[PDB]
Design a protein around this nucleic acid. Structure first.
Lengths: 113, 84
RNA sequence: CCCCCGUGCCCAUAGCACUGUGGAACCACCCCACCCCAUGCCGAACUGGGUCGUGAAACACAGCAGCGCCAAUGAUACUCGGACCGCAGGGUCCCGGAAAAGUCGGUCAGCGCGGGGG
RNA sequence: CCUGAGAAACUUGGAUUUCUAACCUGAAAAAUCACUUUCGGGGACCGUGCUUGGCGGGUAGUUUGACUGGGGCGGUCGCCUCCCAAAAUGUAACGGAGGCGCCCAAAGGUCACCUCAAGACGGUUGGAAAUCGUCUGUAGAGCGCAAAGGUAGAAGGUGGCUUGACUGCGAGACUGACACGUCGAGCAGGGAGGAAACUCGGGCUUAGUGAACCGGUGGUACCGUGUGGAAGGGCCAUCGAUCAACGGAUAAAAGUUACCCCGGGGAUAACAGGCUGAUCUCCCCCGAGAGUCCAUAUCGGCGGGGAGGUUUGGCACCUCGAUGUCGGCUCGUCGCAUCCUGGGGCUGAAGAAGGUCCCAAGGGUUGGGCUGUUCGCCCAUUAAAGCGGCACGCGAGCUG
RNA sequence: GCGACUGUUUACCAAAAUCACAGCACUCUGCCAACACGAACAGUGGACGUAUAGGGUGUGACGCCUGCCCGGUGCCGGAAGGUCAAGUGGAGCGGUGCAAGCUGCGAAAUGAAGCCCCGGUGAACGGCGGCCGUAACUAUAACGGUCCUAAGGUAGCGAAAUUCCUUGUCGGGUAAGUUCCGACCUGCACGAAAGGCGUAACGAUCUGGGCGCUGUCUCAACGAGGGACUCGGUGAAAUUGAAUUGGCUGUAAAGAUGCGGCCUACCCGUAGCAGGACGAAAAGACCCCGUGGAGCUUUACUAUAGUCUGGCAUUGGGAU
RNA sequence: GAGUGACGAUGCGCCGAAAAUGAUCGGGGCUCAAGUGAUCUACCGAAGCUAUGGAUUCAACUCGCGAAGCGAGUUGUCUG
RNA sequence: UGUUAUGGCGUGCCUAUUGAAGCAUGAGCCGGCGACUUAGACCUGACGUGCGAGCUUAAGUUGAAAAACGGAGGCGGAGCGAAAGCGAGUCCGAAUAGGGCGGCAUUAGUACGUCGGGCUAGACUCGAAACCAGGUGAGCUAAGCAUGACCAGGUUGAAACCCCCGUGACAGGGGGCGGAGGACCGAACCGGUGCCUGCUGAAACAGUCUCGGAUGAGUUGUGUUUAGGAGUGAAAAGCUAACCGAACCUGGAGAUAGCUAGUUCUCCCCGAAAUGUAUUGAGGUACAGCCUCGGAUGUUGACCAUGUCCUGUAGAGCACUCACAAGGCUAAAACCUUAUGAAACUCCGAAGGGGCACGCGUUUAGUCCGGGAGUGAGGCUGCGAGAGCUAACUUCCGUAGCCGAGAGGGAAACAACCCAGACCAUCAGCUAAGGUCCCUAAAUGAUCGCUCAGUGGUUAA
RNA sequence: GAAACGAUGACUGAAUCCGCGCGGACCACCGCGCAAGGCUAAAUACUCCCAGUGACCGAUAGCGCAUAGUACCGUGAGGG
RNA sequence: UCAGGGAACUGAAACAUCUCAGUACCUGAAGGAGAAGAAAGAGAAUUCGAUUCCGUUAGUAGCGGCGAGCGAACCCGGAU
């Protein structure tokens, strides 16, 4: 059954990450950096990362209840609870790992000029 | 109640005691009513002085000597040579 | 000496397939069929009563090594057992046993009883 | 006799209601009971005694299976098929695939009879399949359902009659540890189908199953506690269990314990060790390609060969009549895959500040905020502010 | 932050965010009360009380408050109807004997409370979701279909400790804050009498910051007194296979003083340190086992105290 | 300018090779090999086999006594 | 002899275990005490005696001195059936098929004894947690009740009370005054916060120093009542005479104890198992397997040969089945050429193996009846497979050897491996493994070369 | 359980000479015996106390004690 | 000894049934002994004859989640 939730989790997750990763490019007007006008712009970037974190947590606090309250109806025993956790972590941690990595490059451009 | 199943699919456990095989071989002095070879299909057909049971059980129709005969696969008859 | 008819053993080193020789005796077709008996429907089969003609066709004998089928010297696989190797995967040495396949070759039969004919 | 009235006999059942010397209950003189007494008040209800069904964890007594590469959740436990093998038999694993808890008023019995899959050429309300026909055809189809054996002289496809899908039996064998279980020639009684020899005691075989007890219902007239019956009992037959945790405690049984207790275990877990090393760490080989040019200055796809054992873990072997568990503080110390220094090579190295790889552990490697942290972020520095061992070094040292 | 407050407790590990409270609420009881102790129609406590009195439950200064859902459960109420106990009572089946007569089986109607069935009752148990979708300055809140059913959160609050997901995201104080205070809201799993939110005063309560001072610290140093040390006097313990009881590297049931090999080492103390003796101390208080045990719970099994109930009595007499 | 250059197969060996209390093939040492492939011989070396002595278990064969029984020789055992 | 120096070799006992010196259990040492019995006219058997048909029970008599009689009962003395019942036969059944028994190799035995064992009782010995009955006390702490006791000092400043303000007046504000308080500070007293000490204490719970309450729901004395599966409980399952989720004491039994530990004199013989099946079973036990003892038998065992039958691991291979390598070719399946894989493919297919009769070099077991057992997870190793990186001194089958219960030599050390299975004694000899420079014995022996790494002393692309 | 008889707690409530109880559901029959009134060593049971014997002990045995239910623990039961 | 009241481990390898048991403990009464004692009895070859006790009958007939396991009485010898 984990092979079913894994997809539904990765698809929806990567679908968002791939989306925001493209939206952040719409913020960059050109060069970025015109006398002090560099940090104030970063404020807009903070929103992209903030909304990203939540989006990655939603799927975790949504797909989990779909299985937790499912294995209680006499269908799936234990030993799968933690198994499902380590499954969403490899997706959540990986996502955040890409976000911070992406922002590291974006910030290097918005401050470059 | 649920919406999945009472048990996990894909099994592979739980076997069965088998058997069959040959009881009496060539050069055996059996008696009337002695099981020769057990089977389920038709590996060894009945010969002269031999009968066939329900589940194909070649038994001794009379006292004699168990002898096997083969013509090269296909069918193997088992005749019994009576003594005296 | 031959040949035909049945019925056996044998159960493809006897099978199929190219072609031929055969109908006098035997053999089949064919002819007819109210009813015995008979077809999911037809008497093609089964079957009753029976010529000539015929023997492409079913059969019967015969030749030809196309294909099937059988198929050994040597030799390798494996290997009981005996003695070892490499971290291991796995591998070898000695004494016997020792097949698949493929090579040569060999065939399309061989052995009876019975009844009918020259 | 048949209907209705009228009656001081009685008069069962029974609803109301009424009264009351029982009974209950209150003031007074010797206000616990008892005399009595005006009484009054309730009431023959209540309460009490026996009994019926109910509600009943308030209390009592118990149950809550097992396997289980620790327990638990889960899954799985009876039967037959293959496969798994040390090659007849047999044989383990929460080892690899699949079926049963039927079905058949007749695919059964007997006797007659019919040459299947599938392709091909040629025709039909057909242009995939079938159907009709003709060639081919070691049968490649079929056999109710699982697989296998069996695989055509048929069990395979049809028809008539039929219903042995029988009672009384079994020489002698298969199999089992026990109890079951399977197969069976021949006997008899009486029958069925062929003309006959004959076949026939369910179904091509293998699953379609359950001891024993307790009781239902037909047959039989063995007991029947003085004799004679009868009640009840016995034997034939057969029915009932989803006893499915299926060789099966009771007629009938779930949880929790961090309030926990006893008997035991390192034939079973967490710490640590150990074996291991998939995962981790790191070294090396190949050169896709980036790197202007160029594969190796640096970086090295795809794939590979080893190393160390500090990580997840697997196995769980000393240790559960006791190997104290994280971290810090204290004390340290050892290895190198060397963070800083020290010498070197190559650079895509001008200098300068670097990179990288090589050699090299003498010695050194700061102070704080947050954090319980190891770890990590940040502050301010520095030659630098290394990684890992040492029972994740150090509690008979401390903290807690 | 928690609770209002003073007050109480886990005599020998926890005094508190416990409990308790004043205050609010639901309910019960008018009788020899509910209720409770009792072998007892004995006695007594409730009360020499008597209903804004008495028991029960929960909740808990005071303030603004106290939403939607009774389907299921329990609670009161109803009531022609469906099932039932003992018993009354009528046809029947059978046994024995000659017969009178004598004995088993079982029976329509009728037979109490309860059960179903209807209503209500949530400051009674309690409930306030699952499947897919996201766009809208500033202002509160999230929609729309598909649903077992009875519903499916109105105010207020929202990382407090309730928010698993990182330190969630801006903000505040700091040189630097995985903390703490404001906010956002995505509340994995807030929330209304298992009460919400708030609140001055109090708390040996918990949390964070600042002021001041300081050997808590950077580093300690010194002084003192009580041991410790020395001699005279008295003289115990846990422990204890036995012992002339090294070091390394290797083995062995995989952590050796005792095995192997190598190396080190005169014999005996006294202070003293704690690495080892898997050092002591409790047959590990964690796990697994034993159809071992025990408390507790419950819509698990079953009696049963108790309490409801028809009949039978101590319980008769009159009128319809 | 009486010699060279390219591989293919094997016997031996070098690099690759980094561990934590001090190191080592058991150690010392060993190439004037005490390393290793093949060849032979001698010796060594178990409580195995052997020798001299003995005891025990089972059998049969000469015994003595009227008997249970004892002791005697023989083979094996004596399995540890 | 006592003692000793030097050499060699030399891992406590025990229990428990696959494996023990073990850093696993047990134990200071000695001493003595300390564990497989007793019983029933019990069952079943081995040895033995007495009869051979065998024998008494209770009791009755002698009653310094002893044994007898007692012949109720009990065991033999056919069986078969469910039973009626019939019988050197009886049930199944109206059949002559079988089961039970008789005859046949013919015991019928019985009673007493000793000894193995079984059953029932404490029933090898030691140990529970717990259960029940009765009883003990609130001189414990929990509380009620009756009656008394106590609270240095200081601070604060309530209502109420006189009076007063611009103002009819009613709510306020001020000064005086009063003394309220689950008020404040605080000693005693009460209770315990925080640190340190103490931790074989001074002490079975405390000291110093802090801290809390200190007219109060306060502290306290005396007397006194509730009880211990019940009381009490400003509620922790707290307390109820110092370990109370059910006191304590005595009895019910020395409860049960399938779990643990221990079980005492010697020698000789044999010699196990850790398998299979069933199990509310999985360390437990039943049946068999395996052991031994004895009675019958007395070569049937055992390996080795020979012929005879059955399998279809290994291999192979294509024309079957599932996948599969390149082209052809066709409107892709098929068919062709070349080429393949395969536990669950197979037309082929061995080794070895298995049943049988048969015998010799052989050989000396085999079996039947019956007594008493233990073991009932087993460990490693090569081989043959599953699991699992064909990873574990991993696990689960098969198989052989060892261990387990076998030492001795060898592999330095080392259950597993190699050589070998130890009756006793020998300052005696030949070997196996393995070695022969020195630490221990034995060629620092020969010949031909390989080496030069010090390889030989954990690895590969 | 077909399960009689006895035995009562609640209810009921015979006969009393051609009577009643019993005899294992019940009936017939045959058979056996008379309750609801009472008393009775003995042969039985035990062992504080005595006397005798003992393949019983002999002072960590035998009762707990060769002289104590004392010393001592306990509030106490009790233990000893 | 009699009477009134009357367990639970434990057994069934659980367990409510039964078992342990009408044992233990408590209580009431009495004595040297008691309980019981002269048959509406057992029971049956139409037998015997107050009560108790011993042996046997019989670990039979029978009871039983008919599992565990419990388990008479008449007749027959005898104390009397």
């Amino acid at each position: 059954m984990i092979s079913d939730i894994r997809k539904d989790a990765e698809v929806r997750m990567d679908k968002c990450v791939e989306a925001f990763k493209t939206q952040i490019s719409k913020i960059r007007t050109g060069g970025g950096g015109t006398e002090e006008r560099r940090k104030d712009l970063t404020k807009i970037v903070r929103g992209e990362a903030e909304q990203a974190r939540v989006a990655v947590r939603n799927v975790r606090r949504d797909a989990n209840d779909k299985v937790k309250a499912l294995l209680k109806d006499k269908e799936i025993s234990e030993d799968d609870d933690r198994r499902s956790q380590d499954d969403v972590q490899k997706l959540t941690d990986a996502a955040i790992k890409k976000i911070e990595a992406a922002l590291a490059d974006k910030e290097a451009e918005l401050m470059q000029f | 109640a649920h919406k999945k199943g009472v048990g996990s699919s894909k099994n592979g456990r739980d076997s069965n005691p088998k058997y069959l095989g040959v009881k009496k071989f060539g050069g055996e002095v059996v008696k009337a009513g002695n099981i020769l070879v057990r089977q389920r299909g038709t590996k060894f057909k009945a010969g002269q002085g031999v009968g066939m049971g329900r589940d194909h059980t070649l038994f001794a129709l009379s006292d004699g000597k168990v002898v096997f005969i083969n013509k090269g696969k296909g069918a193997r008859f088992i005749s019994i040579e009576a003594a005296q």
